Design a protein around this ligand. Structure first.
Ligand SMILES: CNc1nc2c(CCNCC3CCCC3)c3nc(N)[nH]c(=O)c3cc2[nH]1
Ligand SMILES: CNc1nc2c(CCNCC3CCCC3)c3nc(N)[nH]c(=O)c3cc2[nH]1
Ligand SMILES: [Zn+2]
Ligand SMILES: [Zn+2]
Lengths: 359, 359
């Protein structure tokens, strides 16, 4: 395999399906990336994450640079070896989660474009995110513009830091992040600056920060077409099933979110008929699986009533089973989206999905 | 298979190795039984418990009768179906863990010999423990005697309750529990009373309650020979690796303990060179597996340094990996004990084990 090759195999409207080939593996797009924190996808062995269908996972830079330390992980052989995941890993740049002392050089809380890129190198990341300033929502246009402009200066710094390190440049990929809050002109300036610099993929940053789905979709409507069509489009931090479907309808190829893992541990199970909270007393004697159609190992073997008991009791197996189901559900969603675009029936799928999910 | 058949295949001194055949499976003896609580072996899927080599697990009566309820579990199909373990289950009688208002009828806190036997029936237990009064340590001889005598009255009540229920009598087995604290004459009276009543197996109760290994071994020395030789001998609540080895040297066939699961979640890992606490800073960059010879999946794939990180971080995968290793270690110990008795070299094994474990 190549360092990086994105190929689009089929299209429907603005939606695309295809593949990213990297040295450590192939990523089917549109892709959902389960999130680790602290070098683990919470409550799952890597082999379980893979069995759900995940092709890539996100590593948590912020946590790891604090514990156990990026240099320690490199000493130990890198994140893949450390945690036992041998397929691609995307790492965020660490600044969204830091967001103490902010300046043009970076932030102390320390992190700069150069140090972020070096930490991701030490971790052995396959997809490296440029270091950016996420812009709070709402933002005035002045503030949005200042932030975006800083982020684009930091994007060039990130590019040059990555390219400076031969090992990294030859084996990893680098994504830039579009800012500009909800303002179309700032989103355009941002897209143009990133395209001039040139990246292997382009994230849409600064969304899912409190604006709500209608506003998120409105900004995606104009923002995603601004990015280079022939590179992947990553919507950071999104999201709920219905958010994913509409974002693919608007040209997004990649997704990450803590929703399935975090809310699973809290009792929320995704189903094709909408989310359920398994702690609810109505499930205490319900012998059906979490979802009626789901192919995961959890739905093949255990009832709602058992998982209800486990979560009510605070048992670790409860978090394990809920998280495996939720991540499997997300992967099954992505598979249905891929197959429906490939068959030219995604718009029908989206409508059918919504009718039933919100029934 | 039969309801219950214990066959001794080989002997060495007082040690025995053999098999218990039951309808749901065969149990290799000497056996270690992982403990659930709340219808789960903490942090493990049943298939993982089986992969470690366990032939039977213990269910936690006390917890289950409170949550989710014994009648609810029966409504749902019984404990085996509920939790997904289709092999034998031993259930304790619930009184050790209760130990509010104690009387000849039983205890309120409610539980009596009859209700304990019925709860174990509702759970669908394969090996049912008689309901007894555990005797605190230390105990005066008067107090020990009174308690033992009550327990033997309750043992007959348990026998008659079990036999009254045809379904239970035909498909499950019933064990009696010897009391008498550390007093040989009371242990003899107890053995004699239980033998007169007749049980499928005999537990040694009332030990591992604070007396220390030397005293535990002294009481086993005279107590186990008092029990019928041709039935299994169960030492309840024992214990550390070294306790297990010496107890098999004294004629014990079955063991249960929370030590491997509970202490695993706390950072303690068993190894052939003695226990280690993985939280210790000395492991932070140690690339070796938890134990150098262990065949478990955890030692094949992850380092001490990773598990150290996980437990320090309070990550659920840490508890999962530590518990799988510890239960696998215990099962490997039992296998070495079985093979060494079968080959007439157990006394050598015991000496070698101790020299290295305490090196
Ligand atoms: C939920 N919304 C959201 N998340 C955003 C994130 C994070 C995406 N997820 C990373 C994981 C979080 C735990 C470890 C890795 C964002 N990140 C960056 N760098 N810039 C954004 O504008 C940015 C914007 C984001 N919006
Ligand atoms: C650790 N020592 C110890 N435990 C004893 C236990 C419990 C054995 N383990 C049962 C599991 C605990 C959680 C759910 C099932 C004892 N039980 C009974 N009935 N009588 C004893 O003398 C008795 C004596 C015991 N001594
Ligand atoms: Zn499922
Ligand atoms: Zn091991």
């Amino acid at each position: 395999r190549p360092r990086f090759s994105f190929s689009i195999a089929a299209r429907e409207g603005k939606a695309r399906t295809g593949t990213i080939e990297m040295k450590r593996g192939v990523i089917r797009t549109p892709a959902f990336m389960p999130v680790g924190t602290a070098a683990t996808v919470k409550a799952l062995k890597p082999e379980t994450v893979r069995a759900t269908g995940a092709d890539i996972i996100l590593g948590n830079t912020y946590h790891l640079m604090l514990r156990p330390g990026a240099e320690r992980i490199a000493k130990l052989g890198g994140l893949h070896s450390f945690m036992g995941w041998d397929r691609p890993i995307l790492t965020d740049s660490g600044g969204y989660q830091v967001m103490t002392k902010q300046s043009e050089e970076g932030v102390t809380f320390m992190l700069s474009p150069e140090r972020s890129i070096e930490i991701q190198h030490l971790l052995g990341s396959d997809i490296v995110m440029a270091f950016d300033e996420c812009t709070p929502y709402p933002a005035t246009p002045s503030r949005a513009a200042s932030s975006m402009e800083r982020s684009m200066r930091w994007a060039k710094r990130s590019r040059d830091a990555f390219d400076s390190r031969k090992e990294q440049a030859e084996n990893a990929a680098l994504f830039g992040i579009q800012q500009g809050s909800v303002f179309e002109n700032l989103r355009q300036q941002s897209a143009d600056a990133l395209a001039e610099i040139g990246f292997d993929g382009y994230a849409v940053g600064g969304l899912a920060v409190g604006e709500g789905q209608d506003e998120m979709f409105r900004v995606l409507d104009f923002s995603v077409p601004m990015l280079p069509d022939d590179k992947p489009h990553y919507l950071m931090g999104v999201g709920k099933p219905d958010d994913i479907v509409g974002a693919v309808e608007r040209g997004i190829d990649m997704f990450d979110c803590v929703l399935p893992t975090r809310s699973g541990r809290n009792g929320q199970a995704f189903t094709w008929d909408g989310p359920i909270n398994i702690r609810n007393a109505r499930f205490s004697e319900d012998l059906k699986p979490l979802d009626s159609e789901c192919h995961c190992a959890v739905c093949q073997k255990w009832s709602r009533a058992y998982i209800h008991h486990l979560i009510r009791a605070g048992e670790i197996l409860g978090a394990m089973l809920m998280t495996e189901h939720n991540i499997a559900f997300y992967q099954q969603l992505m598979q249905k989206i891929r197959d429906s675009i490939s068959e030219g029936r995604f718009s029908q799928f989206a409508q059918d999905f919504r009718a039933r999910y919100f029934a």
